[model samples]
Every structure is written in C-alpha cells, then in structure tokens.
Target: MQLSHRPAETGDLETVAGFPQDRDELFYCYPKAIWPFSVAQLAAAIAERRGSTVAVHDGQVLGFANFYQWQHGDFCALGNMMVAPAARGLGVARYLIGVMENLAREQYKARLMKISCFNANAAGLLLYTQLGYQPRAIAERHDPDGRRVALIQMDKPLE
Candidate 1:
C-alpha cells in the first residue's frame, strides 16, 4: 500500500506510454494517445518541462500524470492522467491529482487548476466533482473513430 510520486524519467517512457492497457482505458483518459501509444508523444510532453509524475507502488509504476502552467499562464492544468487497470479503485488517480494540485499551487504559484475529461468518463467526472472542481464549460471534439464526444472542462481554486 506504499505509494510514491516522482518525476518521470526517460527510462519510464515505455511504461508510461503503455499505462492505458486497452481501448476503454485509452478512451476514458487519453483518446489523443490513439491505440498503442508511443514514447515520442510522451517525450514531447516531458520536453515541455511540465511536472510529469509517475506513481509507484512498492516500486512498480502504477500511474502517470502531468501538471503544467497553461499557455495563457493564468492557471495550471492537469493532463494525461491515467492509472493502470490493476491500480484503479485504489485511489491512485486521486493521489496523482492531489500531487499535481500541490505542485500547481506551491511550486508553480498557481491560483487555480483545471482539468479536462471526456463527458462519457463517468468515474472521472465523479472524482473531479467530489474533489470540489466545478464544471466551467464543455467542448465537443471528434474521437479517433470520428465520433463526437463532449470534453468537460473543470476547475478549482487553490486556497
């Protein structure tokens, strides 16, 4: 039950890219990753110098997330959050979000934090709402299958 968060390293690229084990897993967290995510995509993210974190439990990588100053620089955003299938329901996702929020506020000096999740991601939506994130707006986008889906934007003020 020992979980720890640390900056993602180059050696973790493969494990992080493969965090989403299947279609549903990919759809729920990162449809942009497409099927069979690649290290290049993750490398780009880490290259941006965002705070990318790997969640390890008993030394096994269980999840990954990123927190970074948004381009607008007014607030930070939490992105690419996903927990391994076997790690779900163990609060790994929540713990990752908690770590991101802390980094956003303390290190980044951000006043607010935002996150976007597919509206169809019921579990994710519930988790954000439970953590006091308020829905700000919804943006529609096409999924990999060319099907339209609602991207729900949620934000919370850090006090």
Candidate 2:
C-alpha cells in the first residue's frame, strides 16, 4: 500500500470533511465548524489558511490537515488533522505529519511545527506524543455542551 501526500484539491474536500463522525470529533479538529461537518464549512475554515493538505493512498484521500498559521522562518501550526476511520491504525497519521512538517520546514524554513488536541481526544494526545510533539501549553475551552475542557498545544522541532 503506497501512500503519498500533496496539497488538497477540490475533489478531496468532501472525503476529508466526512472524517469527523460527531460533534466532539468536529470540535477537536475544527472548533469553528458546526456539528455534522460539511464541505462548505471546511472550505470556509481553510480559505485563509496558509495551506491545506492530504495524505493519499492508491489514489484515495486517507488523511487531512492544514497549516493554520505560519511565519517565515518561524513556525507552522498544523490544524484540522483527521484520518479516515477506515485508514486509522495504518500509520497514515504519522506520514501525514511528516509530510506537513517538511512542507513547513522547506516552504517557511520553520523552526518547529505546532499542533493542538482537545482533551476529549485521547487517541490524538497519544498519537501526538508518539509523534514527538512536546507539550507546550494547555488552555481552557468549552465543549459543545458548554463543559470546560483543555486544549493541549504541542510542538515538534523541524530544524
């Protein structure tokens, strides 16, 4: 199974948008998006982002993420990372991160790559830690039901 990464295209929007099955997952990946995520909402969120990219496997989009923020020769914050349920546990997430990390390093000469995971996303916390992300901050955020949760911000040195 060969995997590749590239900037997201129009045809990949719906596939990537469908990864979040519920409000919790949506909030974890895209806090601004309403429940039952839609491609339109995805488009709106990424329109001003520095970059939106995907991991492809045999011609199918299996993972997605975006460069939420970037500063030349500084850092790139990766946002909205989601792996298709069917593609989970296959190292796609790692590949996706590696691809995005290099993209940041090469394009912006970034010193590090930043990422965030909501407290509800246990798997994501584990994944980020396993992927070499060092916890940097924790901020309070309200869940969809108005319950308070922590947003764990982490960073990975790229250069």
Candidate 3:
C-alpha cells in the first residue's frame, strides 16, 4: 500500500471527522471530542499549527494525528490519533505515529514524546508498547460523557 504524510489542512477535516463513529472510538482518540466527531474541532486543532498530520493512501486519508509541545514546553504530546476502521491492522497507525514523532523531534526540538490512552483500548496499548512507549502513570478521569475511566500516560525518548 502506498502512503504519504503531510501537514493537515482544512480540506482534510471532513475526512478526518468521518473516522469516529461511536463514543468509544471517539474517546480513544479524542478524549475531549464530543460524541460524533466534527470538522470544527479538528479545524481548531489544525489552526493551532502544532504538528497535525494526515496519512493518505491512494488519495484517501487513512489516519491522522496531532503532536505538539506540552508540559511547560518540555515534552511533545501526541493527541487525537485516529485510524480509519478499514485501515486498522495495516500499519497505517504506526506510520502516522512515526511521522508525528519526526515532526515533534525536528520542529519542536523535543527530547521526549508523550501520549495518553484509554485503558480499555488494548490494541492501542499494545501498539504504543511495541513502539517503545513506557507507561508512566495511570489515572482515572471523567470522559466527556461523565463516565469514569482509566487514562494511561505513556512516553518515549525521541532518540
């Protein structure tokens, strides 16, 4: 499969917005995104100009992620990463992560890359573990819908 990565644009919001169909899927990638993802939320993140990327294959957006500096500008945080359901298990998510890491390292000059995941997402937990992210903490948080859930914090060195 052919794939390409580029800085996210407003045009990509519609396609990205179409990724999350259910509450669980939306929560996994975007903890704060309202149920039924919207282009406006994605457009706002893109407007931040902080390392948002889209993965395209055959002219289709397979996945996207946002990597930005966080924690008093000492770490790069990866957020709102989502892959098309049809693209899962195809390495599309990993590719998007590598691209995001590259941007974090180069553009942000960050030495650490960080991310948070829902504990219920076993696939995502395994993926991050396989990608060398180590769990640093786990905390309970209320989701957008007011449900309590475990949030796992993970990080890895950019090196």
The lDDT leader among the candidates is: 2
Lowest-lDDT window of 10 residues in candidate 1?
Answer: 66-75
Which one wins by TM-score: 1 or 3?
3
TM-score of each model, paired residue for residue:
0.90, 0.95, 0.92
Q: Tens digits of per-residue lDDT for model 2 on 50-156?
A: 67888889878999988889998999999888899888889988888888888899999999998988987888899889989989999999887888999999998
Q: Which order, best to worst by lDDT?
A: 2, 3, 1
Give the residue spans of candidate 3 off by over 4 A: 71-73
lDDT of each: 0.81, 0.88, 0.83
Candidate 2 regions with alpha-carbon error over 4 angstroms: none
* Candidate 1 residue lDDT tens string, 22-73: 7766766655566777899778767775888999998889989886445433
Model 3: per-residue lDDT, tens digit, 1-159?
789998787788888899887988988877666876788877876677477888999989999888644543357888888888789899998998888878777777778899888989999999999999999999999877688999999999987
Model 1 TM: 0.90
Distance from true location, Cα of 88 in model 2, Å: 1.1
Clash pairs detected, candidate 1: none
